[PDB]
Amino acid sequence: PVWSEPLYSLRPEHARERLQDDSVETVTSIEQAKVEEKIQEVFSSYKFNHLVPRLVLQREKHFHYLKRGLRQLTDAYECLDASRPWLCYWILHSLELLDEPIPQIVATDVCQFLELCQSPEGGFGGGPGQYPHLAPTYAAVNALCIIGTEEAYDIINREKLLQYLYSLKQPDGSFLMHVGGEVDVRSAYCAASVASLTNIITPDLFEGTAEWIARCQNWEGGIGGVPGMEAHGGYTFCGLAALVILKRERSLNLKSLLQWVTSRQMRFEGGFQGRCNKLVDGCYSFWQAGLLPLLHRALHAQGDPALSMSHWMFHQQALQEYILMCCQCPAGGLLDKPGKSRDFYHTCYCLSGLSIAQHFGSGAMLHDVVLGVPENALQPTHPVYNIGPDKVIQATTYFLQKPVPGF
Amino acid sequence: FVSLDSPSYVLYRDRAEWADIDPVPQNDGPNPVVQIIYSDKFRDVYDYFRAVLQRDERSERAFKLTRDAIELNAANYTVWHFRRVLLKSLQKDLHEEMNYITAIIEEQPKNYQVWHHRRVLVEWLRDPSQELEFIADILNQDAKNYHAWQHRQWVIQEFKLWDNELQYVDQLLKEDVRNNSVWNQRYFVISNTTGYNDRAVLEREVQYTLEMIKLVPHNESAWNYLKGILQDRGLSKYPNLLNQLLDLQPSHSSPYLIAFLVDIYEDMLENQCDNKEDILNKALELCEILAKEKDTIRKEYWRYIGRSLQSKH
Ligand SMILES: CC[C@@]1(c2cccc(Oc3cc([C@](C)(N)c4cncn4C)ccc3C#N)c2)CCCCN(C)C1=O
Ligand SMILES: CC(C)=CCC/C(C)=C/CC/C(C)=C/COP(=O)(O)OP(=O)(O)O
Ligand SMILES: OC[C@H]1O[C@@](CO)(O[C@H]2O[C@H](CO)[C@@H](O)[C@H](O)[C@H]2O)[C@@H](O)[C@@H]1O
Ligand SMILES: [Zn+2]
Numbered sequence: 277p278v279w280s281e282p283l284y285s286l287r288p289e290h291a292r293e294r295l296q297d298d299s300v301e302t303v304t305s306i307e308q309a310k311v312e313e314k315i316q317e318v319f320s321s322y323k324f325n326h327l328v329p330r331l332v333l334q335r336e337k338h339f340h341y342l343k344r345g346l347r348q349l350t351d352a353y354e355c356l357d358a359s360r361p362w363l364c365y366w367i368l369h370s371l372e373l374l375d376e377p378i379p380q381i382v383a384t385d386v387c388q389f390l391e392l393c394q395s396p397e398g399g400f401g402g403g404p405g406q407y408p409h410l411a412p413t414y415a416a417v418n419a420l421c422i423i424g425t426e427e428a429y430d431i432i433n434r435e436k437l438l439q440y441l442y443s444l445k446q447p448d449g450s451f452l453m454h455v456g457g458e459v460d461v462r463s464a465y466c467a468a469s470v471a472s473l474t475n476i477i478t479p480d481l482f483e484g485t486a487e488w489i490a491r492c493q494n495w496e497g498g499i500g501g502v503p504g505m506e507a508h509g510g511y512t513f514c515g516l517a518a519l520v521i522l523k524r525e526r527s528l529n530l531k532s533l534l535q536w537v538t539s540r541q542m543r544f545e546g547g548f549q550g551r552c553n554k555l556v557d558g559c560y561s562f563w564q565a566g567l568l569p570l571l572h573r574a575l576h577a578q579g580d581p582a583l584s585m586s587h588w589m590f591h592q593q594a595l596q597e598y599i600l601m602c603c604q605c606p607a608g609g610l611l612d613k614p615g616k617s618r619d620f621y622h623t624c625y626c627l628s629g630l631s632i633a634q635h636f637g638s639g640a641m642l643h644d645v646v647l648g649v650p651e652n653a654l655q656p657t658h659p660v661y662n663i664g665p666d667k668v669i670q671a672t673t674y675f676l677q678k679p680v681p682g683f
Numbered sequence: 684f685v686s687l688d689s690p691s692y693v694l695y696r697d698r699a700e701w702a703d704i705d706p707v708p709q710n711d712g713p714n715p716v717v718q719i720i721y722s723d724k725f726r727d728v729y730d731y732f733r734a735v736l737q738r739d740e741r742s743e744r745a746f747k748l749t750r751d752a753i754e755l756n757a758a759n760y761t762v763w764h765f766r767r768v769l770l771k772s773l774q775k776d777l778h779e780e781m782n783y784i785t786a787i788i789e790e791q792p793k794n795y796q797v798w799h800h801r802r803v804l805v806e807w808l809r810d811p812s813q814e815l816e817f818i819a820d821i822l823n824q825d826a827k828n829y830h831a832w833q834h835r836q837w838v839i840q841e842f843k844l845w846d847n848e849l850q851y852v853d854q855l856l857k858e859d860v861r862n863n864s865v866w867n868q869r870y871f872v873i874s875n876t877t878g879y880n881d882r883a884v885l886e887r888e889v890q891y892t893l894e895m896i897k898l899v900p901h902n903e904s905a906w907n908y909l910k911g912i913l914q915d916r917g918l919s920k921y922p923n924l925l926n927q928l929l930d931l932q933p934s935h936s937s938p939y940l941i942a943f944l945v946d947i948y949e950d951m952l953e954n955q956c957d958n959k960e961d962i963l964n965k966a967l968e969l970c971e972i973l974a975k976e977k978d979t980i981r982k983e984y985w986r987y988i989g990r991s992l993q994s995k996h
Contacts, residue, residue, distance in 0.1 A: 293980070296901045296937075303826070304861035347715070351722045357729075358759040363717040385714045392712055404709055405733055407761045456764055458799040495870050495911030501829070504836050506867040508829065532914065535946075538984040539903070546980070552863040553904055554827065582990035589983045 281330050281648065285546055285597045286323045293543040304553050311555055314614050315545050318602050331600040331648035333630070334608065338623065339376050341608030342367050345620055346382065358402030358409075361393055361416035366624035368422045372664055373627045373654045383423045390416045391431045398433060398440030408440055409454040410466035417470040418663050421671040429674050435681040438476040441467050449484025460501035461492050465514035468521040469661055473668070475675035486524035489515045493528050496552065497536030507536060509550045509563040516570050517660050525574040537567045538590055546594035547602070547613075557612045558603040559622050561629020562662065565590055569632060569659040576638060586643040587636055595633045596647040599626050631657045684747060687724060687754050694724065695731040700744060706730035707737055725755050736765055741772035750783075757787065763796045767803060777808050785817060792821050798830040802837065811842040819851070826855060827864045836871055848872045860895055863904045870911060879912055888912055893927070897935060906939040910946060919950035938978040945969050945988065952996045963996050 284290065295312055297305040322328065346367050356363060364386055371378060392404040393416060399408030400416035420428040444452040444463065451463035464485055471477045491503040492515055498507025499515035516533070519525045540548050540560070548560035568588040575583055603610045603626045609618030610626035631654040636643045646653045658665045685692050695701050708730055711718055721729075732752045735745040749766040752759060770780060784801045791797060805811055815838070821831045839848060849872050855865040877884045889912070895905040913921060925947050928940060948966035956962055967989055974985035 298899045298901055300860075300899045302859040302861050304859050346717065349717060349719045351720055351725065353719045354721060354725050354756060355758060357719055357721075357725075357756050358761065360717050360719075367717075381714075382716070385712070385716050388712050388714070389716045392710065401761065402759070404711060405736075406759075407764060409760055453795075454760060454764075456767065457760065458795065458802075494867065495914075496867070496907055500867075501833060504840075504871050505833055506829070506864050534984070538981050539907075541980050543978070543980040552907060553861045553902075554863070580991075581994045582987055584983065584987065587983050589987055591980050591982065594980060 279330070280326075280328050282328055283319075283322070283331075283597055284591070284593050285319050285601070286328060290544070295544070307555065308553075311613065312544050315556075315602060318614055322601055331597070331652070333600060333648070333652040333654075334604055334606075335374055335651065337606070337608035338370070338610070338627075339374060339608075341605075341618070342370050342374075342376075342620075342623065346386075358406060359412060359415075360403045361390060361400055361412040361419060362402075363620055364390065365415040365419040365422075366620040368419050369657075369663060370620070370624050370627050372422050372667070373631055373657060375655050378423065383425065384427065386419065387423060387425075387428050387431055390420060394431065394433060395440075396436070397443075398436030398438070407454060409457070410444065410451070410463050411453065413437075413440075414466035414469055417473060418661060421473060421661075421667050422663050424667055424670050426674070429671065432474055434474055434476055434675075434678065437470065437474065438478070438481075438681045441471060441476075441481060445481065447484075449482075449486070449488035451485075461489060461499060461511045461514045461518070462501075464489055465518040468518040472521045473661065473671050473675065475672070475678060476680055478680060482522055486519060486522050486527045489519055490527040493533065497529065497532030497534075498540075498551075499528075499533075506551055509537075509540060509548065509560045509567075512537065513563045513566055516567055516574075520570055520574065520660055525570075525577075530571060530574060533567070534571050534589065537564055537571070540564050541590050541594070542598075545598055545602070546591065547598035548595070555613070556598070558599060558610060558629070559612065559625035561595055561599055561603075562625040562632065565595055565629050565632055566659050566662070569637075572638060573659075583638075585638060585641045587645075588632070592633045592636075592645050593647055596630060596645075599630045599633075600648060600652070627654060628657050628662055630654055632659065687728075687751055692724075694727045695748070696727055701731065704731070704734050704738070704740075707733035709733065728752050728755055732762060732765075736761070741769055743773060745769060746773060746775070753787070757791050757794050758796060760796055763800055767800070777804055780804055781808075781813065785813075788817075788821065792825060792828055792831065795830065798834050802834060805838065811838050811844065814838045815844065815847075815851075822855075826859060826862055829864075832864050832868065836868070840875070845872065845876050849876075856895075860899055861902050861904055863907075866904045866908045870908065885912065889921075889924070897931075900935045900937055901939070903939060906943060910943065917950045917954065918947045919954050919956060938973060941969055941973055941977055945973070949988070949992065952992065959996060963992060966992055 295305065295308050368378065390400065393400045395401055395408035397408060399413040401408050402412045417432065420431060443455065446452065446459065450459045451467050452459050453463045468482065471481065492499045494500050494507050496507040499512040500506050500508060501511045519527060542549055542556045545556040547556040547558060548564035549556050550560050568590050572583060572588060602614050605611055605618040609623045611618045611622045634644055634646050634653060635656050656665055658668045661668055696706060728751050732748060735748060746769045749762050749769065752762045781804055784797060784804060788797045788801065805814065818831050818835045821828055839845060852865055852869045852872060855862060873879060873884065879885050892905050892909045928943060931940060945966055948962050951962050952959060970985045970989040974982040978985065
């Protein structure tokens with residue numbers, strides 16, 4: 277019947293997926309067991325014997341939470357005073373995913389604010405008068421593209437932005453996060469993302485970058501912040517996404533990467549962990565699961581005859597079950613895991629991940645899997661930039677009509 | 684001098700030694716967005732920070748001010764940058780700053796700016812004498828702190844301090860054999876010292892890992908490390924490993940063991956192994972078993988592997 281929908285996480289065999297600690301306890305297994313015990317309780321609260329009501333994404337609650345945060349915030353957000361463009365991006369992207377229109381007045385106000393965050397040396401800082409930094413620069417550019425008006429597009433000082441990127445480029449192909457700052461894979465992604473969207477890529481800008489990123493892939497198959505470091509979903513997403521933009525995916529061992537990321541989905545919780553033997557977390561619904569559409573495209577470009585034409589290579593239903601049942605705050609907003617407090621970062625990435633899990637697309641093939649009530653369907657998101665695909669095409673088309681600064 | 688929480692703390696707008704300079708308010712525009720309702724103390728400090736920055740005042744008072752700005756928001760990279768400019772301009776005692784960063788990191792170990800600041804200081808001083816012990820203390824509180832491990836690798840590599848790291852790795856693995864950050868460090872140390880080409884070293888590592896697997900069969904890190912040190916040469920290049928794993932099959936079984944077998948078979952088929960049809964059939968049966976029963980969360984992956992094997996062999 278349409279009013280009952282069996283869930284993967286509620287199958288009787290699912291209990292067999294509980295952690296097996298081999299009777300050898302360590303801090304790792306103890307923490308993992310604690311999370312699993314809590315998640316089972318949540319899972320059980322959605323089952324009424326053979327009656328299993330369709331899952332519901334609390335759209336309206338999330339919408340009101342987001343709308344409020346776009347204007348004001350309590351001093352509890354003082355810790356993010358150097359990341360305000362991020363707040364703009366997370367909120368605007370969440371509203372975009374929820375197909376909630378952004379009032380023209382709000383759009384113009386965001387544009388004006390981001391203009392105040394833009395540095396005369398190029399790039400954007402975390403707030404008015406702050407030094408530019410690749411993280412908020414990435415967020416600001418994405419936010420402006422989500423608004424997608426010529427007003428928004430023109431705020432970006434493309435000439436100075438390119439010079440700024442040059443001012444951060446290292447001889448080994450890596451980029452500093454900011455002047456006198458540190459280097460890790462996030463910088464390469466932030467730079468490639470904003471440079472490709474605004475059409476300011478030069479032949480030497482990313483010279484050596486692809487090779488440097490490949491050195492960050494480790495024995496695990498995933499990618500670490502810098503060569504030698506442990507593989508993490510955050511850095512792995514940045515690394516592969518950057519290579520996709522540079523069309524150098526083949527610089528990596530795509531086989532070891534594929535096996536690594538698919539292994540990061542938790543057999544019991546259904547969500548993804550950030551690194552082997554650590555905990556499940558709703559935001560990895562994007563950072564990790566987002567790697568599959570990227571890998572799909574990369575393998576497809578190579579002519580892989582075994583690729584699916586209907587599903588991503590991860591359990592799409594299980595991820596949707598984890599997000600919908602365990603990552604929604606009753607009062608609106610989403611989060612890491614049950615027991616944690618809501619925040620705009622997790623709201624953005626949990627929703628971004630839910631969208632990826634619902635929509636498969638390759639070539640002329642489209643196959644949707646919207647778990648729960650049909651209204652749960654979110655707008656699609658681009659796996660590389662994490663803003664609507666429509667927004668990507670519109671921005672790239674616009675900026676492609678302008679020349680690369682100083683050629 | 685005085686901390687932000689000290690009973691005698693005084694707002695900068697009330698300090699006589701700061702009366703000569705006008706504070707610079709943050710301009711968020713006429714119709715603000717993502718506007719943070721700052722506490723009075725927070726805004727006070729940043730209004731004066733903006734003043735010194737805009738004035739590019741390289742002074743002792745500005746230096747002390749950055750300390751308060753940092754306490755209010757240790758993630759403000761602009762403040763940290765200016766503090767470093769001041770350390771140089773004022774020729775501040777760097778060992779004193781090291782004691783400062785030490786306390787700060789202990790309080791906020793999951794912050795990018797504090798670890799970068801410490802690295803800059805160690806670089807300026809070319810003095811790594813306190814690093815391994817300090818990092819060890821942080822890791823004693825959180826054995827997986829990503830920044831801590833990254834800083835540890837940098838220090839060891841930059842100053843060639845490899846001598847006792849494998850011993851450190853073994854101790855942490857004893858404490859928690861499931862600590863993936865430690866297995867990563869293990870590879871880091873060996874690959875940069877002896878390397879894995881020395882067959883005696885490789886044998887030692889394969890033996891070590893297999894013993895850990897027998898002890899904790901469902902610990903994924905050990906399995907991943909085993910594959911990690913053998914994958915480049917090719918899993919099919921180690922014939923005895925297949926048999927030993929095949930023997931543990933009936934008992935110490937698990938999705939990790941079954942998956943490893945598929946990986947071995949894949950490499951075998953990719954290397955013109957003998958009895959190809961038989962190997963392919965075994966591999967396909969295991970992919971099915973994994974997809975339908977033992978590792979269903981990865982059903983799509985295993986189905987893909989099954990199809991890949993058929994398209995290739
Ligand atoms: C939240 C604000 C921001 C960020 C933005 C977008 C993505 C981010 O990913 C992270 C998230 C976390 C966080 C909040 N601890 C977390 C939440 N869920 C999982 N994790 C690991 C930590 C570090 C990073 C990084 N880089 C992090 C701004 C940009 C500067 C980076 N740092 C330090 C940040 O705190
Ligand atoms: C564009 C951009 C800025 C991307 C960054 C994405 C991202 C999520 C990076 C994570 C980096 C990190 C140091 C994680 C460890 O934190 P942890 O130990 O608290 O988390 P864990 O236990 O899940 O590993
Ligand atoms: O996943 C292994 C895969 O990564 C590469 C880089 O693309 O090398 C990484 O892993 C090796 C161990 O397997 C390390 O020696 C190397 O330093 C690390 O970058 C590929 O060569 C390998 O196939
Ligand atoms: Zn998270």
